[PDB]
Amino acid sequence: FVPFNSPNI
Amino acid sequence: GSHSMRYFYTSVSRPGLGEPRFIIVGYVDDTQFVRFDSDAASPRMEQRAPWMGQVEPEYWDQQTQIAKDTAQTFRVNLNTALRYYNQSAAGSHTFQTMFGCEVWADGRFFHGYRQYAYDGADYIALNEDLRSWTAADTAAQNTQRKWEAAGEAERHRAYLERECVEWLRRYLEMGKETLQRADPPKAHVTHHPASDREATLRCWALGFYPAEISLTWQRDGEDQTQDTELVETRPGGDGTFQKWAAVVVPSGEEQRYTCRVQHEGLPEPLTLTW
Amino acid sequence: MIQRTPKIQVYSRHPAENGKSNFLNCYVSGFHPSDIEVDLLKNGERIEKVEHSDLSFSKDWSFYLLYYTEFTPTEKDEYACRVNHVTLSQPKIVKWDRDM
Q1: Is the domain of B143 the same as that of B65?
Q2: Residues B76 and B163 in one domain
Q3: B neighbours by CB contacts (3+ pairs under 8 Å)
Q4: Cβ-defined contact of B25 to C7 (cutoff 8 Å)
Q5: Which residue positions carry a glycan here (chain C)?
Q6: Which residues of C12-51 are buried (b: 16+ CB within 10 A; e: fewer)?
Q7: CA distance B251 to B248
Q8: Most buried of B92, B136, B156, C89 (most Cβ within 10 A)?
């Protein structure tokens, strides 16, 4: 189950 | 033994030729169960392990949406990397993560990680406290300051110590009929002359799950660790694994040399001779 | 940029027994960047119908892929795996060693 949060470098 | 869920994202850009390709692959232990590939007219997160057919249909929709949204931030991130690294818009570049969580046989969390790679080199990782960031160069340092400002690591720690865990347990139970199995290797030794008065012994191990194994050559007892040439543990392609280790031996002394194979699927370490 | 040249292994899923259905495997690993072309040959000729695993990578960030096709080995036909990658001057071929 992949995390919804995905950050911008 | 222990268990893990591990995910692997790759985004590759192809300037001139449209938007980047983005692939997700997911493993529990040593079995892949899901995949996402953006090279489709309508990409969907898809199962790659049959027990995954048990998830309720809303799952595939929700997962497909997060992947596309992730794929989008990786486009942003690649473009951002050109600024950080003062590169030109000409070439193709790579951006990767890998992350996951570990659990004992009893089902208790004990390790988590998060890591980030630009063009194949370490970029920024989450430290083992799951709270601080190790930035590999002055460029990544710009990302390190951003993610502390936004307290990113907390969402990361949260996912790694909670949702990751809850989910791996459900997957393990859902795929009990295979995932907590351990097929033993099926070993054998082969004889190939290597010189006039020198021959090569090769100790084989095929068909085993999981992929962790020990192939050791011994001569009367003492290991030949520095005089053995192993090959990379490779996949059979059916969910099993293969490996071989080999020793080059002074001719006629075969009986001296012995091969021990340890494996989770071996009631007791198999030993073998040519 | 990191560039890594791929390691290449040819083998059969099950042990080779002529006239028995089997699967020919070409495992390529430890390479970077991820663009790679992999071909499988029957007596020097490209095999149509080849599949590959999904692109993944190891603890040091390098990629690996498994290419494979069904085949039945013969005391006659010989096989080989041909691979091309930015780190290679020329395409690399490594042949199938049934009796390795």
Answers
A1: yes
A2: yes
A3: A, C
A4: no
A5: 2, 20, 42, 49, 59, 92, 95
A6: bbeebeeeeebbbbbbbbbbbbbebebbbbeeeeeeeeee
A7: 9
A8: B156
Q: In what order do the strands lie in the sheet with B214-219?
A: B222-223, B214-219, B257-262, B270-272
Nearest CA in chain C to B242: C13
Based on the fold, state whether residues B86 and B157 are members of the same structural domain: yes
Residue after which a domain boundary falls, among B135, B156, B181: B181
Record: contact B190-C99, CB cut-off 8 A: yes
C1-100 CATH fold: Immunoglobulin-like (2.60.40)
B65: nearest Cα among B48, B47, B45 = B45
What experimental approach yielded this model?
Answer: X-ray
Instruction: Please tell me what resolution, in angstroms, this structure has.
Output: 2.6
Is B160 found in the same domain as B116? yes
- Phi and psi (nearest 5°) for C2? -85, 130
In this structure, what is the dihedral angle of CA atoms B136, A1, B155, B93, given to the nearest 10 degrees?
A: 30
